[PDB]
Coordinates of C-alpha atoms and ligand atoms in Angstrom, one line a residue:
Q1 CA 8.2 -13.2 -6.6
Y2 CA 5.0 -13.6 -7.3
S3 CA 4.1 -15.9 -4.1
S4 CA 3.2 -13.1 -1.0
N5 CA 5.0 -16.0 1.6
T6 CA 2.3 -14.5 4.8
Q7 CA 1.1 -17.1 6.9
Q8 CA -1.4 -19.9 5.6
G9 CA -5.1 -17.6 5.1
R10 CA -3.4 -14.2 5.6
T11 CA -4.5 -12.3 2.1
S12 CA -3.6 -8.2 2.3
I13 CA -0.6 -6.6 4.1
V14 CA -1.2 -3.0 5.5
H15 CA 1.1 0.0 5.3
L16 CA 2.3 2.0 7.9
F17 CA 3.4 4.9 6.9
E18 CA 6.0 5.9 8.6
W19 CA 5.7 4.4 11.8
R20 CA 8.3 3.3 13.9
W21 CA 9.5 0.0 14.3
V22 CA 8.8 -0.3 17.8
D23 CA 5.4 0.9 17.3
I24 CA 4.7 -1.5 14.2
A25 CA 6.6 -4.9 16.3
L26 CA 3.6 -4.4 18.9
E27 CA 1.3 -3.3 16.5
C28 CA 1.7 -7.1 14.7
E29 CA 1.4 -8.6 18.7
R30 CA -1.6 -6.8 19.4
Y31 CA -3.5 -6.1 16.8
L32 CA -2.3 -7.9 13.3
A33 CA -2.0 -11.1 14.5
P34 CA -5.1 -12.0 15.6
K35 CA -6.7 -9.7 13.4
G36 CA -5.4 -12.1 10.1
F37 CA -3.2 -9.2 8.8
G38 CA -0.8 -10.4 6.3
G39 CA 1.9 -8.3 6.3
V40 CA 3.4 -4.6 7.1
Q41 CA 5.4 -2.4 3.8
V42 CA 7.2 -0.2 6.3
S43 CA 8.5 3.1 4.7
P44 CA 12.6 3.1 3.7
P45 CA 14.2 1.1 7.1
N46 CA 17.5 2.8 4.8
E47 CA 19.7 5.9 5.9
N48 CA 18.1 8.9 4.4
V49 CA 18.0 12.5 3.6
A50 CA 17.3 15.1 6.7
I51 CA 16.0 17.5 4.7
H52 CA 15.0 20.3 7.1
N53 CA 13.6 22.7 4.2
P54 CA 10.4 22.1 4.7
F55 CA 10.8 20.9 7.5
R56 CA 11.6 16.9 7.9
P57 CA 8.7 16.1 5.6
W58 CA 7.9 12.2 4.2
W59 CA 9.6 12.6 1.4
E60 CA 13.5 13.2 2.0
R61 CA 13.1 9.2 3.2
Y62 CA 12.8 8.7 -0.7
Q63 CA 16.2 10.2 -1.0
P64 CA 19.2 7.2 0.2
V65 CA 22.4 8.2 1.7
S66 CA 23.3 4.8 2.6
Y67 CA 21.7 1.2 2.5
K68 CA 22.6 1.6 6.9
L69 CA 19.3 0.5 8.5
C70 CA 18.9 4.0 10.1
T71 CA 16.1 5.2 9.6
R72 CA 13.3 8.1 12.4
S73 CA 11.9 4.7 12.5
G74 CA 14.4 3.7 14.6
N75 CA 18.6 1.7 14.0
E76 CA 19.2 -1.4 12.9
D77 CA 18.5 -3.3 16.2
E78 CA 14.8 -2.0 16.3
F79 CA 14.5 -3.1 12.8
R80 CA 15.9 -6.5 13.7
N81 CA 13.4 -6.4 16.6
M82 CA 10.9 -6.0 14.7
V83 CA 10.3 -8.0 11.8
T84 CA 11.6 -10.8 14.7
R85 CA 8.5 -10.3 16.2
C86 CA 6.3 -10.3 13.4
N87 CA 7.7 -13.1 11.9
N88 CA 7.1 -15.2 14.9
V89 CA 3.5 -13.9 14.8
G90 CA 2.6 -14.7 11.4
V91 CA 3.3 -11.7 10.2
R92 CA 5.9 -10.2 7.5
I93 CA 7.9 -7.6 6.8
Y94 CA 7.5 -6.0 3.3
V95 CA 10.4 -3.2 2.9
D96 CA 9.9 -0.3 0.7
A97 CA 13.6 0.1 -1.7
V98 CA 14.5 2.5 -2.8
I99 CA 17.2 1.2 -4.9
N100 CA 16.5 3.7 -8.4
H101 CA 18.7 6.6 -7.1
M102 CA 20.5 8.2 -3.6
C103 CA 19.1 11.8 -3.2
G104 CA 18.9 15.0 -5.3
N105 CA 21.6 16.4 -7.1
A106 CA 21.3 19.8 -5.9
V107 CA 22.0 18.9 -2.0
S108 CA 23.6 20.3 -0.1
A109 CA 26.5 18.2 0.8
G110 CA 27.9 17.6 5.0
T111 CA 26.3 15.0 7.4
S112 CA 22.8 16.4 7.0
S113 CA 21.7 12.7 7.0
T114 CA 19.5 10.5 9.4
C115 CA 22.5 8.4 10.3
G116 CA 25.6 10.9 10.1
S117 CA 26.8 9.8 7.3
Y118 CA 28.6 12.0 5.2
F119 CA 27.7 12.9 1.5
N120 CA 28.5 15.2 -1.5
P121 CA 25.0 15.3 -4.0
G122 CA 27.5 17.6 -6.8
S123 CA 30.1 16.0 -7.1
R124 CA 28.7 12.4 -5.8
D125 CA 30.3 11.1 -3.2
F126 CA 28.9 8.6 -0.7
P127 CA 30.9 6.6 1.1
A128 CA 28.7 5.5 3.4
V129 CA 27.9 2.4 1.0
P130 CA 30.7 3.4 -1.3
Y131 CA 29.3 4.7 -4.4
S132 CA 31.4 7.9 -6.5
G133 CA 31.0 8.9 -9.7
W134 CA 31.7 6.0 -11.7
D135 CA 28.3 5.0 -10.1
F136 CA 25.1 7.3 -11.3
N137 CA 24.0 7.2 -15.2
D138 CA 25.4 11.0 -15.4
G139 CA 27.2 10.2 -18.9
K140 CA 24.2 8.0 -20.1
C141 CA 21.7 10.5 -19.9
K142 CA 21.5 12.6 -23.2
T143 CA 19.5 15.0 -22.4
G144 CA 20.1 18.8 -21.6
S145 CA 19.0 19.0 -18.1
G146 CA 20.1 15.9 -17.3
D147 CA 17.0 15.4 -15.9
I148 CA 14.0 13.4 -16.7
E149 CA 11.6 15.4 -19.8
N150 CA 10.0 13.7 -21.1
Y151 CA 7.9 10.2 -20.9
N152 CA 8.0 9.3 -24.8
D153 CA 11.3 8.7 -24.0
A154 CA 11.8 5.5 -22.5
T155 CA 15.3 5.4 -22.5
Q156 CA 15.4 8.8 -20.8
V157 CA 13.0 8.1 -18.1
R158 CA 15.1 5.2 -17.5
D159 CA 19.0 6.8 -17.9
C160 CA 18.0 10.6 -16.9
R161 CA 17.5 11.7 -13.3
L162 CA 14.2 12.0 -11.7
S163 CA 13.2 15.4 -10.9
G164 CA 16.9 15.4 -10.0
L165 CA 17.1 12.3 -7.9
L166 CA 21.1 11.3 -8.4
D167 CA 20.0 7.8 -11.3
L168 CA 22.3 4.6 -9.9
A169 CA 23.8 3.4 -13.5
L170 CA 22.0 0.2 -12.0
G171 CA 24.1 -1.3 -15.3
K172 CA 27.5 -1.2 -13.0
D173 CA 28.1 -5.2 -11.7
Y174 CA 29.1 -3.3 -8.6
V175 CA 26.0 -1.4 -8.2
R176 CA 23.6 -4.2 -8.6
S177 CA 26.0 -6.2 -5.9
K178 CA 25.7 -3.4 -3.8
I179 CA 22.1 -2.9 -3.8
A180 CA 21.9 -6.8 -3.6
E181 CA 24.3 -6.7 -0.1
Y182 CA 21.9 -4.3 0.8
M183 CA 18.7 -6.6 0.5
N184 CA 20.1 -9.7 1.5
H185 CA 20.6 -8.2 4.4
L186 CA 17.2 -7.4 4.2
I187 CA 16.6 -10.9 3.6
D188 CA 18.5 -12.7 5.7
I189 CA 17.5 -10.3 9.7
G190 CA 14.2 -11.6 8.2
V191 CA 12.2 -9.7 5.3
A192 CA 8.9 -11.5 3.2
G193 CA 9.1 -9.3 -0.1
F194 CA 10.0 -6.0 -1.3
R195 CA 7.9 -2.6 -3.0
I196 CA 9.9 -1.4 -5.2
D197 CA 9.7 1.5 -5.3
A198 CA 10.1 4.1 -8.7
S199 CA 10.0 1.1 -11.2
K200 CA 9.5 2.8 -13.9
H201 CA 12.8 4.4 -13.7
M202 CA 14.2 1.0 -13.9
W203 CA 15.2 -0.9 -16.8
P204 CA 13.8 -4.9 -16.2
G205 CA 16.7 -6.1 -16.9
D206 CA 17.9 -4.2 -14.6
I207 CA 16.2 -4.8 -12.0
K208 CA 16.0 -9.1 -12.8
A209 CA 20.0 -9.1 -12.6
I210 CA 19.5 -7.6 -9.4
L211 CA 16.5 -10.2 -7.7
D212 CA 19.1 -13.0 -9.6
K213 CA 21.7 -12.2 -6.6
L214 CA 19.1 -12.2 -3.5
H215 CA 18.8 -15.1 -0.8
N216 CA 16.5 -17.6 -0.2
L217 CA 14.1 -16.2 2.7
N218 CA 15.1 -17.3 6.0
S219 CA 15.0 -20.5 6.8
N220 CA 14.2 -20.4 10.3
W221 CA 10.7 -19.1 9.1
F222 CA 9.9 -19.2 5.5
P223 CA 9.6 -23.0 3.4
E224 CA 13.6 -24.6 2.0
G225 CA 12.8 -22.7 -2.1
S226 CA 11.6 -19.8 -0.7
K227 CA 12.0 -16.4 -2.7
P228 CA 11.2 -12.9 -2.1
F229 CA 7.6 -11.3 -2.4
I230 CA 8.0 -8.3 -5.3
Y231 CA 5.6 -5.5 -6.3
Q232 CA 7.2 -3.3 -8.3
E233 CA 5.9 0.5 -8.6
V234 CA 5.0 1.8 -11.8
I235 CA 2.3 3.7 -12.6
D236 CA 0.7 3.2 -15.4
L237 CA -3.3 4.6 -17.4
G238 CA -2.0 3.9 -20.5
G239 CA -0.4 6.0 -23.7
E240 CA 3.0 5.7 -22.6
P241 CA 5.7 3.9 -24.1
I242 CA 6.2 1.8 -21.3
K243 CA 3.8 -0.5 -20.0
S244 CA 3.3 -2.6 -16.7
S245 CA 3.3 -5.5 -18.4
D246 CA 6.9 -5.0 -18.9
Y247 CA 7.9 -5.9 -15.2
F248 CA 5.4 -8.8 -14.9
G249 CA 8.7 -11.3 -14.9
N250 CA 10.4 -9.0 -11.7
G251 CA 6.7 -10.2 -10.3
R252 CA 3.9 -8.4 -9.0
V253 CA 2.9 -4.7 -10.4
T254 CA 1.1 -1.5 -9.0
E255 CA -1.9 -1.0 -10.8
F256 CA -2.4 2.5 -10.3
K257 CA -6.0 2.7 -12.8
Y258 CA -7.9 0.6 -9.8
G259 CA -8.2 3.0 -7.0
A260 CA -8.4 5.9 -10.0
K261 CA -11.4 3.8 -11.4
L262 CA -13.0 2.9 -8.1
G263 CA -12.9 6.6 -6.9
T264 CA -14.2 8.0 -9.9
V265 CA -16.9 5.2 -9.9
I266 CA -17.6 5.4 -5.8
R267 CA -17.8 9.1 -6.2
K268 CA -20.1 8.7 -9.1
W269 CA -18.4 11.0 -11.4
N270 CA -17.8 10.9 -14.8
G271 CA -21.2 9.4 -15.1
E272 CA -19.9 6.1 -13.8
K273 CA -22.0 4.5 -11.6
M274 CA -21.6 0.9 -8.9
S275 CA -23.9 -0.6 -11.7
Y276 CA -20.8 -1.2 -13.7
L277 CA -18.7 -2.5 -11.3
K278 CA -20.2 -6.1 -12.5
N279 CA -17.2 -6.8 -14.6
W280 CA -15.0 -5.4 -12.2
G281 CA -11.4 -6.6 -13.1
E282 CA -9.8 -7.7 -16.4
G283 CA -12.8 -6.4 -18.2
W284 CA -11.9 -3.3 -16.9
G285 CA -8.8 -2.8 -18.6
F286 CA -5.8 -3.9 -15.8
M287 CA -3.9 -6.6 -15.7
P288 CA -3.9 -9.2 -14.5
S289 CA -5.3 -10.7 -11.4
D290 CA -2.8 -12.6 -10.9
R291 CA -0.1 -9.6 -11.3
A292 CA -2.0 -6.6 -9.5
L293 CA -1.2 -5.1 -6.4
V294 CA -4.1 -2.8 -5.3
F295 CA -5.0 -0.4 -3.6
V296 CA -7.4 2.0 -3.5
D297 CA -5.0 5.0 -2.7
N298 CA -1.2 5.3 -1.4
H299 CA 1.5 7.4 0.5
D300 CA 1.8 9.6 -2.6
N301 CA -1.6 9.5 -4.3
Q302 CA -4.1 10.2 -1.0
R303 CA -2.3 13.8 -1.4
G304 CA -2.2 15.0 -5.0
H305 CA 1.6 14.4 -5.3
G306 CA 2.2 12.5 -9.0
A307 CA -1.2 11.5 -7.9
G308 CA -3.6 9.6 -10.6
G309 CA -6.2 12.5 -10.3
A310 CA -9.0 14.1 -7.7
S311 CA -11.0 11.2 -7.5
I312 CA -8.8 9.0 -5.4
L313 CA -10.5 8.4 -2.3
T314 CA -8.9 8.6 0.9
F315 CA -9.5 8.7 5.1
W316 CA -10.7 13.0 4.6
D317 CA -13.5 10.8 2.5
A318 CA -14.2 8.7 5.1
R319 CA -18.0 7.5 4.6
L320 CA -17.0 6.6 0.6
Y321 CA -13.1 5.6 1.7
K322 CA -14.9 2.5 3.7
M323 CA -16.7 1.5 0.4
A324 CA -14.5 1.5 -2.3
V325 CA -11.6 -0.3 0.9
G326 CA -14.6 -3.1 1.4
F327 CA -15.3 -3.8 -2.0
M328 CA -11.5 -3.4 -2.8
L329 CA -11.4 -6.5 0.1
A330 CA -14.4 -8.2 -1.2
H331 CA -13.6 -8.7 -4.8
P332 CA -11.8 -11.1 -6.0
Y333 CA -9.3 -8.7 -7.6
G334 CA -5.8 -8.5 -7.4
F335 CA -3.3 -9.1 -4.7
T336 CA -5.2 -5.8 -1.6
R337 CA -3.0 -3.2 0.2
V338 CA -4.9 -1.2 2.6
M339 CA -3.7 2.6 3.5
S340 CA -2.7 3.6 7.2
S341 CA -2.3 7.0 7.5
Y342 CA -1.7 10.0 9.6
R343 CA -3.8 13.1 10.2
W344 CA -1.1 16.1 8.5
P345 CA -2.5 20.2 8.6
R346 CA -4.4 20.6 5.3
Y347 CA -4.3 23.4 3.7
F348 CA -5.9 24.9 0.7
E349 CA -5.0 27.8 -1.7
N350 CA -7.1 26.3 -4.1
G351 CA -6.8 23.2 -5.9
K352 CA -2.9 23.7 -3.7
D353 CA -2.6 21.5 -0.3
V354 CA 0.8 23.8 0.8
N355 CA 1.4 21.1 3.5
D356 CA 1.4 17.7 1.1
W357 CA 4.9 17.6 2.1
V358 CA 4.1 18.5 5.7
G359 CA 5.8 14.4 7.9
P360 CA 4.6 12.5 10.2
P361 CA 3.2 14.0 13.6
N362 CA 6.5 14.6 15.2
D363 CA 7.9 16.7 18.4
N364 CA 10.7 18.8 17.2
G365 CA 11.5 15.7 14.0
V366 CA 11.4 12.5 16.8
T367 CA 8.8 10.3 15.2
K368 CA 5.3 10.3 17.7
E369 CA 5.3 7.2 19.2
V370 CA 1.5 5.4 18.4
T371 CA -1.0 5.5 21.5
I372 CA -3.6 2.7 21.2
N373 CA -6.9 4.7 23.2
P374 CA -9.5 2.7 24.8
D375 CA -12.3 2.6 21.8
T376 CA -8.8 1.0 20.0
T377 CA -8.4 4.2 18.1
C378 CA -5.0 6.0 17.3
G379 CA -4.0 9.2 19.4
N380 CA -1.2 11.2 17.9
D381 CA -2.2 12.2 14.4
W382 CA -1.9 8.4 13.0
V383 CA -5.2 7.8 11.4
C384 CA -4.9 4.0 11.4
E385 CA -7.6 3.0 9.3
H386 CA -7.1 -0.3 9.4
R387 CA -7.7 -0.8 12.8
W388 CA -11.9 0.9 11.6
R389 CA -14.3 -1.9 12.3
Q390 CA -15.7 -1.6 9.2
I391 CA -12.2 -1.7 7.3
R392 CA -10.6 -4.5 9.6
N393 CA -13.8 -6.6 9.1
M394 CA -13.0 -6.5 5.7
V395 CA -9.8 -7.5 5.6
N396 CA -10.9 -10.7 7.5
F397 CA -13.9 -11.3 4.8
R398 CA -11.0 -11.1 2.6
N399 CA -9.3 -14.6 4.2
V400 CA -12.8 -16.4 4.8
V401 CA -14.1 -16.2 1.0
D402 CA -10.8 -16.6 -0.2
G403 CA -10.8 -19.3 -3.4
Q404 CA -14.8 -18.6 -4.0
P405 CA -15.7 -17.5 -7.2
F406 CA -17.1 -13.8 -7.9
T407 CA -20.2 -14.9 -8.2
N408 CA -23.9 -13.9 -7.2
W409 CA -23.7 -10.2 -8.7
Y410 CA -27.1 -8.0 -8.6
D411 CA -27.2 -4.3 -9.8
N412 CA -30.6 -2.0 -9.9
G413 CA -28.7 -0.6 -13.0
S414 CA -28.1 2.5 -11.5
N415 CA -25.7 2.7 -7.9
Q416 CA -27.0 -0.6 -5.4
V417 CA -24.7 -3.2 -5.7
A418 CA -24.1 -6.6 -4.4
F419 CA -22.3 -9.8 -5.1
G420 CA -21.2 -12.7 -3.1
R421 CA -17.8 -15.0 -3.0
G422 CA -18.8 -18.2 -3.6
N423 CA -21.0 -20.0 -0.8
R424 CA -18.1 -18.6 2.2
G425 CA -19.1 -15.0 1.7
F426 CA -21.8 -11.8 0.6
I427 CA -21.5 -7.8 0.7
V428 CA -24.0 -5.7 0.0
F429 CA -24.1 -1.6 -1.4
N430 CA -26.1 1.3 -1.6
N431 CA -24.7 4.4 -3.2
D432 CA -28.3 5.5 -4.7
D433 CA -30.3 8.0 -3.4
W434 CA -32.9 6.2 -2.0
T435 CA -33.1 3.0 -0.4
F436 CA -32.0 -0.2 -0.9
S437 CA -34.7 -2.4 0.5
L438 CA -34.6 -5.9 -1.6
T439 CA -35.1 -9.8 -0.7
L440 CA -31.2 -11.1 -2.5
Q441 CA -29.9 -15.0 -3.0
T442 CA -26.2 -14.3 -1.1
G443 CA -25.3 -18.0 -1.7
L444 CA -25.2 -19.3 1.9
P445 CA -26.2 -21.6 3.5
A446 CA -29.1 -21.0 6.1
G447 CA -28.9 -19.1 9.7
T448 CA -28.6 -15.7 11.7
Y449 CA -25.9 -13.8 10.3
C450 CA -24.3 -10.3 12.1
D451 CA -23.0 -7.3 9.8
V452 CA -19.4 -7.4 10.3
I453 CA -19.2 -3.5 9.4
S454 CA -21.7 -2.6 11.6
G455 CA -21.0 -4.5 14.7
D456 CA -19.1 -8.0 16.0
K457 CA -20.3 -11.6 16.6
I458 CA -19.3 -12.0 20.4
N459 CA -20.3 -15.1 22.7
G460 CA -23.0 -16.2 20.1
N461 CA -24.3 -13.1 19.3
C462 CA -23.9 -9.9 17.1
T463 CA -23.1 -6.5 18.6
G464 CA -24.4 -5.2 15.3
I465 CA -27.2 -5.6 12.2
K466 CA -28.6 -9.4 12.0
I467 CA -29.2 -10.6 8.9
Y468 CA -31.2 -14.4 8.6
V469 CA -30.5 -16.4 5.7
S470 CA -33.3 -19.2 4.6
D471 CA -33.0 -22.2 3.7
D472 CA -33.0 -21.2 -0.1
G473 CA -29.8 -19.3 0.8
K474 CA -32.0 -15.6 0.3
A475 CA -32.1 -13.1 2.9
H476 CA -33.6 -9.3 3.3
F477 CA -31.3 -6.1 3.4
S478 CA -32.4 -2.7 3.9
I479 CA -29.6 0.1 4.1
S480 CA -31.2 3.5 4.5
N481 CA -29.6 6.2 1.8
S482 CA -28.1 8.7 3.9
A483 CA -26.9 5.3 6.6
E484 CA -23.2 6.3 8.1
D485 CA -21.8 3.0 6.4
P486 CA -24.3 2.1 3.9
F487 CA -22.4 -1.1 2.4
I488 CA -23.7 -4.6 4.2
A489 CA -21.6 -7.7 4.6
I490 CA -21.4 -11.5 6.3
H491 CA -19.9 -15.0 5.6
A492 CA -19.6 -18.3 7.0
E493 CA -17.7 -16.9 10.3
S494 CA -19.9 -14.7 11.5
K495 CA -22.4 -16.7 11.2
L496 CA -24.2 -18.0 14.6
Ligands
CA1 CA1 16.9 5.0 -13.0
CL2 CL1 3.1 1.7 -4.1

């Protein structure tokens, strides 16, 4: 479950949050494939609750009604069509598996579901699965409210309702099987792995028992013996009885310390400065690199939702955001996930975004397609951070330098740093209030290199800044403190 299963030479997965299957399918063939992306994390593909108050919030997709592959992103035909087309061009699909619970216990019974299935939360009735009262932890939970009341109690965090969400009895073989059934449906369709939603709220053993029932990946695209890639969502910033390491047996785990710390550093808050990033990684208290699923922000924290703090950088902070993502993509630590979002009508009430619930761009509830402007940007309020040249070129930078060791690090004691990856790449950052002008050892072979942040290499020339690495591997860098993108990057494939 530790192998990404991505095509030979691809190191990142992008989260196309709330995107529709047909758009992802197209996105794979026209952009993701030729741009070297490894895979796409898709929003939950199973039928969820249609919550009309508020109007179709993004979080309704985290409230299962059944395992029918029918959502606002598309039906089963479209889902299968997407997986096939993406796999045919070397781009993998990773499913966000919401298996810890069904919907909120207070949701009204009826057919307000993305596929019309009937369900009765009050009576614990989900016939489309089917699940009955016998399949939830109502009698196992020992709290007075029946919900999770204290995270200092590892047991209730696992057996009680997460904010009211009906907690599935993952200890029962029947439930474990119904879930395995759903996941094998996805695997057989072509899925390459899963993001396991709310991993902290399930015993590491129940998850395992579920994974033990899964098929090997589709043998038309994946080698024999291939197991689904597994990265469990566990928010652990320390201090809790539950640790991210408790899940290393099932696969990789989300490292929420990564984004929180990088953001505080890049924003230069709490006395942090980029020069401190020289021992970035385990040296900062993070989990082992071979188990970490890193990212700057995710669909949750870019909204402050159960977020890791205000330090989290997002597309709203474009300039600093690109530096954060660039550094992550260049640093060998962990497996990188790039975020891609939609712009919502953010409105504050003093540290309160009352519009953080707003779902994806839509027309009366129907998710809007992703239009592609000529400058390769996206319309209909889709941010598409993964298409920003600075991020897109850094995704390839990670591919190019893959396997090379972190070396040639330099820092000015403040916020001007630079480091390379073996003899295949070198990146430079200036986050100080003055100019960064210096000759640095890049560890790269002599030549003229295109800065892949400012431009691209095309027809034996650069469209942006050019860097000249002399015979001893040294090159001059000059990044103004007021540059729109205060960082430069070059690698073996950007060389003329
Ligand atoms: Ca649970
Ligand atoms: Cl996540």
